[PDB]
């Protein structure tokens, strides 16, 4: 089933997601949603679920869904 | 302090690093060594030190240096 953001909204591939940190943000479009330990291992990430997206500085980020915001579902 | 692999070898940018998982591996050349909180946040990773590399399937991996092997330094 679906993975949800910090506002309970289903996250889809291609959606713009956002997470802030002290000094900046990571914002960009979802490329993949990883939900099993095996898929996480294959994609080189840890602790699913992970939302994989490229941010505004062209950095590939893997982030937990429950602490980001899907801007397209706001 | 330098950044070292699981065999205590200093890792350099460009070195092939390797980590196995059940069903595959992640192997590729180090592109960046992240040691500061500032750079970790900019690159969307946690808990420096991290070594950043693209694996043989074009997955961008961020990994603890001390839990992988620097193949070029064997």
Residue numbers in the entry:
A (entry chain A), B (entry chain B): 4 to 77
Share the article's original sentences.
We have identified a novel gene that is associated with changes in virulence, CNAG_02591 (hypervirulence-associated protein 1, HVA1), through gene expression microarray analysis that compared two mouse-passaged strains to the pre-passage H99W strain. The HVA1 gene is predicted to contain 3 exons separated by two introns that encode a 75 amino acid protein. No known protein domains or homologous gene families exist for this gene. Metabolomics analysis suggests that when HVA1 is absent there is a block in the citric acid cycle, while structural analysis of the Hva1 protein suggests a potential interaction with NADPH.
